[PDB]
A paper describes a structure:
To further decipher mechanisms of such an intrinsic quality control pathway we analysed here the contribution of three yeast large ribosomal subunit r-proteins rpL2 (uL2), rpL25 (uL23) and [name] (eL34) for intermediate nuclear subunit folding steps. [name] is part of a range of intermediate nuclear to early cytoplasmic LSU precursor populations and its association with LSU precursors was previously found to be independent of the ongoing expression of rpL2, rpL25 or [name]. Structure models obtained from single particle cryo-electron microscopy analyses provided evidence for specific and hierarchic effects on the stable positioning and remodelling of large ribosomal subunit domains. The structural analyses performed here provide evidence for strong and specific effects on the yeast LSU precursor folding pathway upon blockage of the assembly of three different LSU r-proteins.
Here, only two major folding states (Nog1TAP_L34-A, Nog1TAP_L34-B) were observed in single particle cryo-EM analyses (see S3 Movie for an animated overview). For both, the pre-[name] folding status resembled the one of state Nog1TAP-F which was observed only for a minor subpopulation of ribosomal particles in the control sample (see processing schemes in S5 Appendix). Defined densities of [name] domains III, IV and V and the 5S RNA were virtually absent as well as associated factors and r-proteins, including [name] itself. In contrast to state Nog1TAP_L34A, in state Nog1TAP_L34B many of the factors were lacking which were bound in Nog1TAP-F to the [name] RNA and to the LSU [name] domains I, II and the ES7 element (compare Figures G). In summary these structural studies indicated that both rpL25 and [name] have a crucial role for the stable positioning of LSU [name] domain III in nuclear LSU precursors. Moreover, they provided evidence that initial positioning and remodelling of LSU [name] domains IV and V and the 5S RNP depend on the upstream assembly of rpL25 and [name].
Numbering used by the authors:
A (entry chain v): 175 to 227
B (entry chain K): 31 to 48, 72 to 134, 138 to 295
C (entry chain t): 56 to 102, 131 to 171, 177 to 195, 199 to 217, 222 to 268, 277 to 296, 303 to 311
D (entry chain i): 34 to 57
E (entry chain G): 70 to 117, 125 to 204, 207 to 226
F (entry chain m): 239 to 299
G (entry chain n): 203 to 208, 213 to 239, 250 to 256, 352 to 370, 387 to 394
H (entry chain o): 88 to 179, 194 to 213
Amino acid sequence: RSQSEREEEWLEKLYKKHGDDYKKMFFDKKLNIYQQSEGDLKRRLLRWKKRNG
Amino acid sequence: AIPRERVIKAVNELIKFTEELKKDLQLIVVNNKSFTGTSKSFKLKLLNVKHSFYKPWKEASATAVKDFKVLLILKDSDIKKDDLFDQLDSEGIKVDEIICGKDLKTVYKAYEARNAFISQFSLILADDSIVTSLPKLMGGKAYNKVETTPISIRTHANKEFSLTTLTNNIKKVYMNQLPVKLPRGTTLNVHLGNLEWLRPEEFVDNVELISEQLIKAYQIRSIFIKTNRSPVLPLYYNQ
Amino acid sequence: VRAESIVAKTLATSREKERIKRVSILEDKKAKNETQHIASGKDFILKEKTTYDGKPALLFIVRVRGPLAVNIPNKAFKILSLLRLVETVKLTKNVYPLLKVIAPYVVPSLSSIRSLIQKRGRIIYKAEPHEIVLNDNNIVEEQLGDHGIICVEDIIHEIATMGESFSVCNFFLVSGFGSLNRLRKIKQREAESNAATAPVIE
Amino acid sequence: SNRTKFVRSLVREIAGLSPYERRL
Amino acid sequence: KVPPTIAQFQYTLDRNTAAETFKLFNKYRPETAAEKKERLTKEAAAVAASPKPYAVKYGLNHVVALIENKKAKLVLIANDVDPIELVVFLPALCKKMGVPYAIVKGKARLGTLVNQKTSAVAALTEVRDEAALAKLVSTIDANFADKY
Amino acid sequence: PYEPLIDWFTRHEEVMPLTAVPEPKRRFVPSKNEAKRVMKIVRAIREGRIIPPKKLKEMKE
Amino acid sequence: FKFPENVDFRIMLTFLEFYSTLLHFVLYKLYTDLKKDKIIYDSPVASLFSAFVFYVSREVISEAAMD
Amino acid sequence: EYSGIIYVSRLPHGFHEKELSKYFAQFGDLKEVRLARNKKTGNSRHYGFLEFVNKEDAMIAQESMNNYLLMGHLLQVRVLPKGAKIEKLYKYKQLKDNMKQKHEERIKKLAK
RNA sequence: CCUUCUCAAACAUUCUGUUUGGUAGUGAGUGAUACUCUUUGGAGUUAACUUGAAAUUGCCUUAAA
């Protein structure tokens, strides 16, 4: 299992905008279109980093 | 020039005499021959002031009961175009909200909503092209104040919208100008600002600069420095 | 009839009357050349924005039939009666102030002008109110041949050209119901849809 | 359930009293 | 001569206020099947951040779910529903919940504004225009509840 | 026969909603069904079995 | 003539439609075998008048184009 | 019973005596109609008074226009008791020396 | 029962800065003393706050049938 291209782009946008600041990333109104929890966001970001960097 | 000693005495007298507005709000009043007898246009004059009186307002409005907000009315084309951040944040100022002419007549048409919305802002800036249409949208109450009354700004370069034009115009208005109304009566008064604005050392310079334009630009009859309902301090006399 | 109709009529009449009043005041002030209390001292016409050249250009006139809610004022009534445009001169400096007033109530090449003249074909003739058709060229010769008009083609040429018959002839000369015809009218309503200082809209 | 009790009371007020209940 | 719970219908909003309510409701017509399909196809093509949409609520079960939550501000009820029991209690439920309600003649007329052949009820929860909705609610109240 | 009925219960407005199950996240988030439909249309376009409306306008010739 | 013309037009409309449809194919066959828009051997007719460039007055060059 | 005098309030913008006379005349001719306007400015206060020729016509008009809604304004019409006539509604070097003296007086007063 | 006056000129060469003119308003209500004038005949101005667009009487017909 992997992440979709659109999902990868969405993760990259949030990572660039907030880095590892999960709390700040949670409140991003115009990038966190879907109000994902901190746990889901961090898990997805860790998966992306492991797959890519 | 007029004696600055008079202004130095007047500011100290205001300090001695000193409702936060009635406490510290400093203003200058002018008497003249009640111009524009046959007209009632709300045209304003942006007095040239070398002091950024709006900066203390932004800094001081944090603890104020009525927060300070920046309003920028723009024409339909301009809104459709990080515009407010990339060119103003570096200077410590930014436009909080942008309102279109169509928006005022659809989402803010209600008088109850209009009075509560327009009252939240003090730096009311509007494009020159749309300045004429403003009074038909926000009614009269907006013009009852020198604060809420729209201030015309030139955003057009070669008749075309320019980011640099808007940036420099808003910067000059914020830090290099002070609006004042011209009512159809003898009384002309400029709301200089609260005492915390431009500590009295610069207050004398501001008063002198304002009085220069008042004397030269108009056939003023008398000039006084006043606080709300307080005794008028004679600043200058001429005939 | 409900009060809403009369209320809307009164409001629209007041608004358009104020609009016409500002236009008249602006024109009167411009006539004095005192460009010190008016937004624009010059004149403009909108096709895009175009300057109103002083040349007395001649263009066709069309009727828009509205705004309907605006009861026609007395000045507009008189202007339309003189121009007989009420039913659904030239662009001179003295005609523009009156044409601008009826601007909201109103708006070529040889191909269009010739066809329009040869198709409409109004001819005042003696009953007295006869205006049927351009029956025969001899009628023009009898009634208007004294001015150098041997046929209607002369009138057409002099209207296209800067002649005298252009002025003389003034004394001589989806639209359905049913369900099927409603959609076309609704579509045309989009094309069917005004500041005093703004240029004239063509 | 509070909602069920509310619905039952609403139905009771709407339906009134039955002919045999009206005898009371 | 029928039980009071019946004949609450046949007293309805007047022509003027009914027309005003219909005009207000027509603004929030839900995206029909064709419009939604074409918009979704356009979005997919563009793909190949978003405001909440506004539309009227008309499903009887959905409306009743919104009713008793106090979210519904104004509800329209058809007076010609063949299973009258489906709507006998709705006015009483709205009165108990304090939600203004208006009886409009014709279920077909009610459904014509929601892209459906017929619609038993219609309710509004969100608005674009709040002053107009409040004025319409006040007019409907003064003309229907205080009279009947 | 049809005596008046007293609104002994409706005369007092319901102070609080009766329901439960607090608001789902989907009500505050864009619909997932819309995303699913958009992705299905994207897949169809990738397979070449759906023509975008812009291309349909050109093909209308 | 190019003058205004002073009955159930539905029959006329149908006849016009049919004749136009026929003439479309006729013209296509014949052809198989732009500022002017704003202004507007085999027989003695062809043999005669050849190269005889005529000038037509208000009643080949046309004076009407001078307008 | 109430008299023919009729009172109206919450008139929409643009409503004036013209409409109050034209529309209400359809029900029946009215003795008088007047509108409340400020003395300083000719604009109306959105209310006025008018009297019908007969009490029955007045109450019929009041009932038929009791709570009508007009472009966002709900117009209330009230029938009044006997009397209450519709009245009062209508379609509305010396200077330099004095200045010097006042300046001296102000200089004296500001020490107060 | 529709819906709102969306820049004119000059200089400027900075990816365009300055001047003139251009801002003709729903009403009602509260408000602690300052600039004036006709000086009795009451009129023009001057901080601040509330608001359902709130309210009792200031002496041109195809938007057609």
